[PDB]
Amino acid sequence: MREIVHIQAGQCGNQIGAKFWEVISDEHGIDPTGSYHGDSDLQLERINVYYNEATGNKYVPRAILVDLEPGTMDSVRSGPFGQIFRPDNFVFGQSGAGNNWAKGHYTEGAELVDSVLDVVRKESESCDCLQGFQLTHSLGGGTGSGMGTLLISKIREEYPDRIMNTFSVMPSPKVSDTVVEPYNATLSVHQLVENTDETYCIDNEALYDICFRTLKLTTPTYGDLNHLVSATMSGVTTCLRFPGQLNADLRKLAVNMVPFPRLHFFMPGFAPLTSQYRALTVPELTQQMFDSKNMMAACDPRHGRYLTVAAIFRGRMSMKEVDEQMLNVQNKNSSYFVEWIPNNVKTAVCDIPPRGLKMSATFIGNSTAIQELFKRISEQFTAMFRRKAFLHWYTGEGMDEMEFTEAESNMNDLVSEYQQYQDA
Amino acid sequence: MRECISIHVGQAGVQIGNACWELYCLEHGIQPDGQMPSDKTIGGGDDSFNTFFSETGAGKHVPRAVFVDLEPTVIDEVRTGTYRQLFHPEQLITGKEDAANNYARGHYTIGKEIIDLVLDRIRKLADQCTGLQGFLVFHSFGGGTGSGFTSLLMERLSVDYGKKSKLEFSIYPAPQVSTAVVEPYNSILTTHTTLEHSDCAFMVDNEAIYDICRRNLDIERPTYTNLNRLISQIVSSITASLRFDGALNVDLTEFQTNLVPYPRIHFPLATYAPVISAEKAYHEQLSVAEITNACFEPANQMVKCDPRHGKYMACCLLYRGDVVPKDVNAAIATIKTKRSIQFVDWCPTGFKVGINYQPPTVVPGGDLAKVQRAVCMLSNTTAIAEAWARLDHKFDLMYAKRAFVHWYVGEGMEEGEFSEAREDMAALEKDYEEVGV
Amino acid sequence: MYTFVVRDENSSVYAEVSRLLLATGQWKRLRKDNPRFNLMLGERNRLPFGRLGHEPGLVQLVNYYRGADKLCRKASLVKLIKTSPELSESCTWFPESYVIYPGNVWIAKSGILISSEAHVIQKYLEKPLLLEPGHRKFDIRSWVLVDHLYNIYLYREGVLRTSSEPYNSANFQDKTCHLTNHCIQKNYGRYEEGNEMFFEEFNQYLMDALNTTLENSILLQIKHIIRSCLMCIEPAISTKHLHYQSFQLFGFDFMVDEELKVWLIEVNGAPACAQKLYAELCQGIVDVAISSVFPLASIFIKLHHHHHH
Amino acid sequence: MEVIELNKCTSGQSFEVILKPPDPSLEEIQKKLEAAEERRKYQEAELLKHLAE
Ligand SMILES: Nc1nc2c(ncn2[C@@H]2O[C@H](COP(=O)(O)OP(=O)(O)OP(=O)(O)O)[C@@H](O)[C@H]2O)c(=O)[nH]1
Ligand SMILES: Nc1ncnc2c1ncn2[C@@H]1O[C@H](COP(=O)(O)OP(=O)(O)CP(=O)(O)O)[C@@H](O)[C@H]1O
Ligand SMILES: COc1cc(C(=O)c2cccc(-c3ccc(C)c(O)c3)n2)cc(OC)c1OC
Ligand SMILES: Nc1nc2c(ncn2[C@@H]2O[C@H](COP(=O)(O)OP(=O)(O)O)[C@@H](O)[C@H]2O)c(=O)[nH]1
Ligand SMILES: [Ca+2]
Ligand SMILES: [Ca+2]
Ligand SMILES: [Mg+2]
Ligand SMILES: [Mg+2]
């Protein structure tokens, strides 16, 4: 289990997806033409996980770029690392999806999906041992949301024994394109609950607040938010991308993080928050990574309990200090970690730090506090759905009201399920 | 002589195998290429060391070893490492995909497709043996391969080699050393399924070894290399009597007879002194009294527990170095008066002593200092049930909520196998208490 | 912030040690089943000692000594004294006791029988010391705190659990004058409040009626008995060099006979204090047994005597 | 304290010292492995049926 196939879908999917490849290609010393110009051997020992080796000692991202309009993907090709992607893996329709889940899932996306799958199969075929897939997308638009979850469903049919992973950006009125986002996210969450093993919940509310409050950026662009997303993505993929101690893969992560199959929605976080000169002491990293102000999902971890936790430290530091500090928060905040899963916090260290920082920490929590995210979207949904407002956009693409009622129920179930274990 | 096959399942098994075979090679004067200059019978023999090594016409000495892992990375470091010429490639067996810390995946799913291959490579070694005793099996309780594939091997080894003895070296899981959350489940499952198939099993709690490395080797944050090098000294002690001239514990059957009167209660507590740092400039060498006395201190045990609140069924003292019988008996006389050493009423209060005059060998550049004399006590105390209770409690906590269970069921395993395995462990805890109070 | 759990709700003593710790602002109480504690305040039966001291990063302490039940049950207390050389079968301060399973006056106990006809049969002290005015039996309760280092701390205040019925040689079946237990009595408080004479008053009686002191006539023999009993079992129960540590409050029960000779009756593993003394004793447990291991931001007498021979 | 059964050699010696006197078959394994492969392949069928819907 080494190779991963990366898929990025829609405006948001391709934007954050493009930053991920910029960030991680700099860490593995791959330039914008695909040539290695690094210094350590540790940069290339697990390069197979995300890149294929081509003729002339080039590295090509195992990346499939999907959209239902050409705009964003043309920006990616024009952009700084655009030339590194395999040109055959740009798969794109022309008419767009108009921020409509139904267009993505049932009509426009249907027309395009089989050709995405042909590239997925192509990339899969030349993998020695495929461990699974990761998708970058939002749940608030139409392509990444609707088509993205169509793909997920299809990939599960063809590769039922491989791991499905998502970086799923959740919508918020603070960072909002259209009023139908709550509908699009509720239809997608139902898909994610059934058809994925792990989902990183990036809430745009939380990214905005981090940019506003805890970084002093008065007017945040999507690029400012996507700086935070790409840094977290680098964070959570560290163990996959460098050696080593725990032979780290998607399945082992899934087995240990997910005590109940539906509850696989993780609350990622990063320390230190950037946009520095002083390096953080190991106590500070440990305080900050566990701090609400550093979480990428707008939930108070104090309103729930941790089922499982995975913390990944990056840089040259005393592991003695790390273990003491990691034991200090568990023993000083012990009510917030469930007693019925012994030793639920798992710590890992990697010697190489990310660009810019001397040391850093990535947090991955399966907290029952995530319910707040789903309740927030369930309320925004019901506000509109009780008056059947904006439904014509979907019913015009063949969907029934029944399908909305179902998704509403399936999400409120998810919320009940998280509540069961927060009091248990 | 009678040949012994060592089997190393999983990462923990394999890396501990590496450590042991490195040490054995140093002890018998066998080199990385596999030549043994001090051997005069070229091409063969029936010396005590031949129980663990076969020989070839060109003079190579070859471990009676099978390394089995469901993924290649760890055994690939044996294939490319210091002792690459030592093993025949057919002894080193790897899969493609590990068991993701899942008993069921190791036992049922990925086990089924590889069990026949491994038994075949085991048969290739059993056919080179004039009179096979049986097997030493090394594994973790926590790993999926270590828990799951081991238990299926132990099932099949009972069928194909019903006459032969099976000893375990088992690594019990510890939060302080790369534990996953599901290892308590894995530990109970494999313990249940392996219980009837194992004659004598030596548990090594990673917690105990880790603190020994902190306290006595001054190692801030012990690595697997530190832990394994130390575990292999305890292993060498225990297997010394199979590989060297002597009259205590000369075959695998004797380990069962001397240490295991009640067949289910077959987990002897190992205790080991002295453990001393090679970076320590000034060290006053410890005596026979002081190291025999160190055998009754919990801080030196392979599992932390309190023998004073339990009862002994058997006690062996295996000395390595400058020791003579009268020094041992004088130390035993002193210690009996000071400490609480209660035996069961149906067993003779006593000690079977084994002394080998060659002091312990140390790996050059290792963490352990050379010592004039050392000892490994093997005592079958009921105190070791303390470890079963801890492990059982963690299982109960998670299993009350059905936490993680779906991953096991998803590999074809029935939910009932959990509570079944836990009932055997409930019976096991009760056996210890009857015998012990 | 140190942490503790509570697993005995009946414990009058550790109820107060629980409340004193919380009201320091430096000790959080956790749930009964939370493994991540510095201090257990454990159960009486089935206390899970095998789970203690295996929590990385916590130093764990508990208010019971595993193995201390051997001194605290009646059946095994007799068996301890008959078998150990350091308190021989010719032990002068223990009433001649025997064990058979289910002046020649005896007593049976584990519902108490006193006759010559009729678990443990014990020599009944026919000629006990009698406090006047009253002509009445009493027993002395001494509180002992053994800390993690095995320092034996005797609390300076004890109590006489008195009777209030004249003692009788011919009449055994009447239990109120022979058995001096606080529960069995409730003349309940005629001579002293609640049948409780504290050490200051009892010292003065001895000075007046007997021309001696509490320290000389009785308390030296108590200190010898406590120290003889605890040093006997130290190898079996000491938590020096162990992965968790233990302390324990013990309650020693004594009888003083006519010629001022002190006799051990029972050692009590989970003792209740006396109503007045809770305040001072429970604070001393905290100072000496708990805060020594877990320091924050003398009421005892230490028992030790290395005589050379 | 009696020191019995003393045996010696050049590499060591050994003795005892007393202070006081007093399986399922190949069919059934391949069976219940295959019973778990059925439940595995049943679960995969209910998935591929649910996806066909
Ligand atoms: N003492 C020691 N323990 C180890 C070693 N490697 C792993 N462990 C322990 O074994 C448990 C994990 O099991 P492993 O043996 O690594 O797993 P595996 O058997 O390879 O199984 P999968 O990876 O699940 O296929 C944990 O308790 C680890 O601390 C080692 O080299 N020495
Ligand atoms: N050998 C003896 N001689 C005189 N009196 C005796 C005696 N044995 C017992 N008693 C009396 O019987 C009473 C109760 O007996 P005992 O002290 O054995 O039980 P107990 O369990 O109630 C003490 P506690 O519960 O306070 O620890 C004592 O107060 C004592 O006066
Ligand atoms: C995909 O990135 C990660 C992978 C892993 C693992 O592969 C892994 C292996 C063994 C055990 C665990 C684990 C994970 C979580 C918990 C709560 C646990 O008890 C064990 N994981 C691990 C990661 O985090 C350290 C990864 O994130 C980068
Ligand atoms: N964090 C982040 N969110 C985005 C970005 N682009 C769009 N979004 C969010 O994604 C949703 C709109 O979906 P979008 O990806 O544009 O639609 P699609 O192209 O049809 O999938 C809204 O909630 C936006 O706030 C981005 O670059 N970063
Ligand atoms: Ca069309
Ligand atoms: Ca030879
Ligand atoms: Mg848009
Ligand atoms: Mg492994």
Side-chain angles (χ1 to χ4, degrees), chain A residues 1-54 56-291 293-424, chain B, chain C residues 1-185 187-309, chain D:
Chain A
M1 268 182 50
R2 87 181 80 105
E3 291 93 359
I4 293 178
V5 177
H6 169 91
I7 307 171
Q8 56 191 62
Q11 189 165 38
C12 179
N14 278 274
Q15 223 78 258
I16 74 181
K19 303 295 166 199
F20 173 76
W21 294 104
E22 287 166 28
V23 171
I24 69 141
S25 296
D26 164 275
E27 295 192 3
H28 292 298
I30 312 303
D31 67 42
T33 72
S35 287
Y36 175 72
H37 276 85
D39 54 316
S40 175
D41 274 313
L42 297 170
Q43 293 184 322
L44 294 180
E45 197 168 290
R46 297 203 63 188
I47 200 67
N48 273 50
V49 177
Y50 282 99
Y51 303 77
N52 294 313
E53 188 155 31
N57 296 320
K58 285 260 192 297
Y59 292 96
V60 181
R62 209 173 300 94
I64 307 173
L65 296 91
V66 182
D67 209 345
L68 283 161
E69 62 192 7
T72 307
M73 278 172 54
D74 280 314
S75 303
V76 169
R77 215 191 314 266
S78 292
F81 265 78
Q83 319 290 195
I84 203 178
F85 295 110
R86 191 196 308 287
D88 277 348
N89 296 5
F90 290 74
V91 173
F92 60 91
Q94 289 290 346
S95 65
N99 300 278
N100 190 320
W101 196 80
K103 293 193 181 222
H105 208 70
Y106 292 130
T107 60
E108 301 299 334
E111 182 157 14
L112 187 57
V113 73
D114 290 354
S115 45
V116 176
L117 293 162
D118 293 333
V119 175
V120 171
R121 201 173 305 100
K122 193 83 181 166
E123 289 287 359
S124 275
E125 275 164 3
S126 67
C127 287
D128 183 55
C129 193
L130 176 72
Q131 46 173 324
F133 305 87
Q134 73 182 42
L135 174 82
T136 61
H137 69 153
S138 60
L139 314 185
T143 304
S145 195
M147 198 187 164
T149 57
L150 182 59
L151 287 154
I152 282 162
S153 188
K154 300 267 171 181
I155 291 155
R156 199 182 173 183
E157 197 173 41
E158 201 176 334
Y159 311 88
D161 58 336
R162 307 296 96 203
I163 298 285
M164 178 54 62
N165 211 75
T166 62
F167 293 89
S168 299
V169 174
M170 320 302 294
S172 184
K174 295 179 192 180
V175 188
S176 193
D177 295 353
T178 52
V179 302
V180 296
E181 288 166 0
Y183 289 144
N184 297 343
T186 306
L187 295 157
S188 284
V189 170
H190 185 20
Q191 297 296 309
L192 298 181
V193 168
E194 282 199 349
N195 292 324
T196 81
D197 297 291
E198 300 154 44
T199 290
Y200 299 111
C201 301
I202 289 85
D203 193 330
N204 264 356
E205 182 145 293
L207 305 187
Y208 179 84
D209 293 337
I210 287 158
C211 289
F212 184 47
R213 302 167 192 185
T214 320
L215 288 175
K216 309 306 189 200
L217 307 178
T218 42
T219 321
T221 59
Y222 283 123
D224 294 325
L225 314 197
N226 297 346
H227 172 79
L228 295 167
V229 177
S230 72
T232 301
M233 284 184 73
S234 172
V236 309
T237 55
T238 296
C239 303
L240 297 165
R241 291 182 306 104
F242 302 91
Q245 263 320 263
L246 21 63
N247 193 43
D249 67 51
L250 298 177
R251 193 177 317 281
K252 283 162 180 273
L253 214 218
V255 175
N256 288 295
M257 289 296 295
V258 189
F260 309 103
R262 286 152 55 78
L263 316 190
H264 58 272
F265 290 102
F266 305 154
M267 173 183 293
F270 194 71
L273 295 166
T274 59
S275 51
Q276 255 292 84
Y277 302 126
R278 188 174 82 74
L280 281 68
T281 69
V282 167
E284 291 159 333
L285 277 190
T286 298
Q287 279 292 109
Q288 283 176 52
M289 90 187 297
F290 272 97
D291 198 341
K293 300 182 218 281
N294 295 48
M295 305 289 168
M296 310 295 158
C299 303
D300 198 345
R302 294 176 153 283
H303 293 200
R305 292 170 89 206
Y306 289 115
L307 297 163
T308 63
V309 192
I312 293 97
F313 291 84
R314 279 197 86 174
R316 303 176 89 270
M317 68 192 91
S318 178
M319 293 170 73
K320 187 214 216 288
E321 210 168 329
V322 167
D323 288 342
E324 282 168 16
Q325 289 311 308
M326 286 308 295
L327 285 170
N328 193 61
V329 287
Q330 292 177 71
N331 294 315
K332 292 200 81 176
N333 307 282
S334 62
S335 96
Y336 299 121
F337 299 83
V338 300
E339 83 279 358
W340 49 267
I341 301 173
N343 311 116
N344 62 346
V345 186
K346 169 68 169 203
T347 315
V349 187
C350 169
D351 298 317
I352 304 91
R355 173 159 227 70
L357 296 155
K358 286 289 194 62
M359 51 199 304
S360 71
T362 300
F363 175 83
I364 303 187
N366 185 348
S367 177
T368 60
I370 199 74
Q371 77 171 289
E372 293 181 338
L373 201 159
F374 299 120
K375 282 193 297 185
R376 217 145 44 216
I377 293 173
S378 200
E379 283 168 12
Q380 292 164 21
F381 183 99
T382 293
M384 298 190 286
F385 191 72
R386 79 200 161 173
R387 303 290 283 275
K388 300 173 174 195
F390 309 97
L391 268 192
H392 71 96
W393 297 121
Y394 301 86
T395 59
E397 307 294 312
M399 283 186 72
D400 206 70
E401 303 187 354
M402 190 65 88
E403 191 165 342
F404 281 70
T405 300
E406 287 169 20
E408 181 182 61
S409 295
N410 306 131
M411 193 147 73
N412 288 324
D413 283 354
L414 181 63
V415 170
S416 306
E417 198 181 337
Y418 276 117
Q419 187 66 46
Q420 190 190 341
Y421 300 113
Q422 191 178 288
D423 291 317
Chain B
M1 67 77 186
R2 309 189 58 198
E3 293 89 354
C4 283
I5 294 164
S6 296
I7 311 172
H8 312 280
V9 181
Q11 177 174 304
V14 166
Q15 296 191 149
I16 292 170
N18 274 312
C20 293
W21 288 97
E22 176 187 51
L23 182 49
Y24 293 168
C25 284
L26 289 178
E27 279 171 23
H28 299 305
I30 306 170
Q31 288 179 328
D33 61 338
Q35 291 300 301
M36 191 184 162
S38 79
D39 192 355
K40 311 307 179 185
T41 38
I42 296 164
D46 52 3
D47 302 334
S48 287
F49 72 82
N50 292 128
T51 57
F52 272 56
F53 299 78
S54 61
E55 285 180 76
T56 68
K60 180 181 277 179
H61 289 75
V62 173
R64 295 183 205 277
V66 176
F67 292 71
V68 185
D69 203 7
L70 302 181
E71 68 96 357
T73 58
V74 185
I75 288 173
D76 280 331
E77 288 168 54
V78 180
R79 283 161 189 155
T80 57
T82 315
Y83 289 88
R84 70 187 157 273
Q85 301 158 254
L86 203 75
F87 308 99
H88 199 250
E90 302 185 311
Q91 301 167 245
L92 312 181
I93 311 165
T94 54
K96 274 183 182 163
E97 207 147 289
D98 68 55
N101 307 332
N102 187 339
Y103 176 88
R105 194 169 176 80
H107 189 97
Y108 292 102
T109 307
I110 300 172
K112 186 155 186 293
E113 82 188 41
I114 206 164
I115 192 54
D116 293 318
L117 174 54
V118 174
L119 294 166
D120 204 275
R121 303 292 179 76
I122 289 166
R123 185 70 76 189
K124 285 200 199 291
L125 288 185
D127 290 358
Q128 292 179 65
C129 294
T130 55
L132 182 76
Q133 296 188 43
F135 310 96
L136 297 308
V137 195
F138 297 77
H139 65 109
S140 53
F141 277 4
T145 301
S147 72
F149 181 74
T150 303
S151 77
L152 178 55
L153 195 63
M154 297 290 278
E155 277 194 307
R156 290 285 285 277
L157 288 187
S158 286
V159 171
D160 297 12
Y161 304 87
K163 306 295 178 181
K164 323 301 175 161
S165 282
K166 305 209 281 308
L167 274 50
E168 291 177 78
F169 288 92
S170 291
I171 310 298
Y172 173 106
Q176 228 152 7
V177 184
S178 314
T179 207
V181 229
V182 299
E183 297 189 353
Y185 281 176
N186 294 340
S187 304
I188 276 88
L189 292 171
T190 192
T191 297
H192 165 61
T193 304
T194 311
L195 203 57
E196 301 308 316
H197 303 254
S198 179
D199 293 294
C200 175
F202 297 105
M203 279 196 283
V204 182
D205 187 335
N206 262 343
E207 185 188 71
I209 300 298
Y210 183 90
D211 285 336
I212 286 158
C213 283
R214 287 206 284 183
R215 194 189 322 104
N216 295 0
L217 306 179
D218 310 316
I219 303 283
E220 210 165 81
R221 182 63 161 76
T223 66
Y224 283 141
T225 300
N226 303 127
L227 304 165
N228 291 352
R229 282 165 160 2
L230 172 56
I231 288 155
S232 60
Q233 293 281 312
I234 284 77
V235 172
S236 189
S237 270
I238 300 157
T239 65
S241 59
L242 297 164
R243 301 177 289 121
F244 287 120
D245 184 11
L248 184 70
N249 298 333
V250 279
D251 63 44
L252 302 186
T253 319
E254 208 173 308
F255 285 95
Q256 172 269 299
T257 298
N258 292 342
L259 301 168
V260 193
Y262 206 114
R264 273 169 66 82
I265 303 174
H266 61 260
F267 302 94
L269 184 59
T271 319
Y272 187 90
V275 176
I276 302 295
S277 178
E279 314 310 324
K280 203 186 183 205
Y282 186 69
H283 172 57
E284 295 171 348
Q285 282 287 329
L286 295 159
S287 68
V288 170
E290 298 169 304
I291 72 169
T292 308
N293 188 44
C295 297
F296 299 86
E297 290 272 278
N300 303 319
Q301 293 167 185
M302 296 301 98
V303 185
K304 275 169 204 192
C305 53
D306 201 331
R308 306 176 294 174
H309 308 112
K311 292 192 184 202
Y312 293 98
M313 291 161 267
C315 199
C316 276
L317 291 156
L318 301 168
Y319 294 91
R320 289 249 260 192
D322 180 40
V323 182
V324 304
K326 87 91 63 57
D327 279 31
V328 171
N329 294 336
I332 289 162
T334 331
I335 294 160
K336 175 58 183 194
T337 62
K338 286 185 186 290
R339 298 182 179 281
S340 309
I341 298 163
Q342 189 88 314
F343 262 72
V344 299
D345 288 331
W346 80 84
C347 288
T349 304
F351 297 85
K352 286 198 181 61
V353 191
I355 297 168
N356 179 312
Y357 296 128
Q358 192 181 8
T361 315
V362 277
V363 177
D367 310 287
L368 275 158
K370 182 208 80 76
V371 300
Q372 291 163 9
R373 62 199 70 73
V375 62
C376 184
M377 179 161 85
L378 290 178
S379 63
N380 197 335
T381 174
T382 58
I384 211 160
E386 286 182 41
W388 297 133
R390 289 161 57 210
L391 205 64
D392 287 337
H393 182 64
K394 293 184 197 216
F395 187 104
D396 290 344
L397 288 174
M398 289 199 278
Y399 193 74
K401 272 59 173 179
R402 252 26 137 234
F404 301 96
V405 170
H406 74 278
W407 289 115
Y408 292 84
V409 171
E411 302 292 355
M413 191 176 133
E414 299 190 300
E415 169 162 303
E417 194 174 339
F418 275 75
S419 55
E420 175 191 292
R422 180 65 186 100
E423 276 327 281
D424 200 7
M425 293 300 318
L428 190 71
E429 283 201 74
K430 211 138 193 274
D431 295 357
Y432 278 104
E433 201 185 19
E434 284 169 42
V435 169
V437 189
Chain C
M1 264 270 200
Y2 303 117
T3 47
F4 75 102
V5 302
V6 169
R7 299 155 71 76
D8 191 351
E9 304 300 333
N10 291 31
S11 190
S12 15
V13 175
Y14 288 103
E16 185 58 31
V17 175
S18 179
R19 196 194 67 74
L20 263 159
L21 284 164
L22 288 170
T24 329
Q26 286 166 107
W27 283 86
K28 183 157 195 172
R29 186 174 160 180
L30 312 165
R31 299 170 310 285
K32 67 213 256 82
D33 267 71
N34 193 337
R36 294 166 179 283
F37 55 84
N38 291 126
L39 176 63
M40 182 164 286
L41 294 179
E43 47 268 57
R44 285 181 63 177
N45 281 33
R46 310 212 72 79
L47 189 163
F49 293 103
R51 298 215 291 281
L52 299 173
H54 302 278
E55 274 307 326
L58 295 170
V59 176
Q60 302 202 313
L61 182 60
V62 56
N63 67 331
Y64 282 88
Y65 258 103
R66 191 182 192 194
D69 64 276
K70 298 284 279 283
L71 202 70
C72 301
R73 300 298 106 75
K74 297 168 205 290
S76 46
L77 177 59
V78 171
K79 222 215 80 173
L80 179 61
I81 295 163
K82 288 184 146 182
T83 54
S84 316
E86 44 264 294
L87 8 145
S88 60
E89 40 67 55
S90 67
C91 174
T92 65
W93 44 261
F94 197 58
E96 190 185 343
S97 296
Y98 288 82
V99 197
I100 305 288
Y101 299 100
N104 202 78
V105 179
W106 306 77
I107 184 170
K109 52 185 185 181
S110 83
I112 306 89
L113 195 156
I114 319 178
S115 183
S116 301
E117 296 271 288
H119 271 64
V120 283
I121 312 165
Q122 184 164 67
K123 183 72 186 74
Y124 191 73
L125 301 167
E126 296 169 47
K127 298 221 284 276
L129 192 80
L130 305 171
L131 293 155
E132 315 292 7
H135 202 78
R136 61 204 171 84
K137 191 174 271 191
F138 69 99
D139 74 56
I140 300 172
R141 156 61 69 76
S142 302
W143 289 282
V144 187
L145 180 60
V146 188
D147 77 355
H148 68 280
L149 306 178
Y150 223 85
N151 291 326
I152 292 157
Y153 291 105
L154 174 50
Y155 178 44
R156 74 197 171 196
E157 307 298 339
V159 69
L160 278 71
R161 300 184 299 183
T162 64
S163 199
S164 43
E165 308 299 318
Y167 182 83
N168 201 283
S169 286
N171 190 30
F172 297 119
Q173 259 76 54
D174 197 289
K175 290 179 177 174
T176 49
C177 85
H178 283 282
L179 283 60
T180 71
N181 298 123
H182 189 281
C183 82
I184 301 295
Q185 300 279 279
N187 315 62
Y188 174 57
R190 187 179 156 197
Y191 309 97
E192 59 286 309
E193 195 183 4
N195 292 13
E196 290 184 359
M197 195 195 300
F198 293 88
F199 273 15
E200 195 191 56
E201 189 177 313
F202 183 57
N203 193 50
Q204 193 69 60
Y205 166 82
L206 289 164
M207 283 183 148
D208 297 335
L210 274 166
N211 193 27
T212 195
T213 62
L214 178 48
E215 180 56 60
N216 297 36
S217 61
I218 287 156
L219 211 68
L220 270 168
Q221 296 164 85
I222 287 162
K223 289 183 291 188
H224 177 65
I225 293 155
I226 293 157
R227 205 163 60 74
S228 297
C229 278
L230 295 171
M231 293 298 193
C232 174
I233 63 171
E234 182 182 349
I237 72 168
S238 172
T239 64
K240 192 189 184 197
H241 319 129
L242 205 67
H243 48 277
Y244 68 94
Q245 282 168 305
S246 287
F247 67 83
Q248 190 172 338
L249 181 74
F250 297 93
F252 281 80
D253 289 348
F254 300 104
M255 280 284 292
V256 193
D257 78 8
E258 65 179 18
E259 282 283 5
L260 298 158
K261 194 182 176 180
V262 177
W263 303 80
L264 181 68
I265 302 302
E266 207 210 334
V267 193
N268 212 255
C273 195
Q275 184 53 37
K276 182 197 174 181
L277 300 167
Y278 280 105
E280 195 174 44
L281 175 56
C282 301
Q283 175 56 38
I285 294 163
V286 169
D287 285 343
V288 178
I290 292 171
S291 289
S292 58
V293 182
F294 305 109
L296 305 166
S298 185
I299 68 163
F300 297 105
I301 304 159
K302 200 187 158 169
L303 309 193
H304 57 259
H305 211 93
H306 265 87
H307 172 227
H308 290 83
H309 51 263
Chain D
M1 198 176 303
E2 195 182 32
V3 179
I4 77 170
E5 289 216 58
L6 174 57
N7 186 83
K8 311 170 79 198
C9 68
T10 35
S11 66
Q13 49 182 316
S14 49
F15 59 96
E16 183 166 349
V17 57
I18 316 191
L19 318 190
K20 187 195 164 285
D23 287 351
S25 56
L26 180 46
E27 187 210 49
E28 297 177 76
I29 287 163
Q30 299 264 119
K31 174 189 171 81
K32 296 195 170 172
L33 285 184
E34 282 182 350
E37 185 170 18
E38 288 289 275
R39 292 189 297 287
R40 189 201 335 292
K41 204 147 177 160
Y42 171 97
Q43 283 168 13
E44 195 186 30
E46 290 299 285
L47 175 53
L48 288 170
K49 193 218 174 194
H50 187 276
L51 288 187
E53 296 198 342

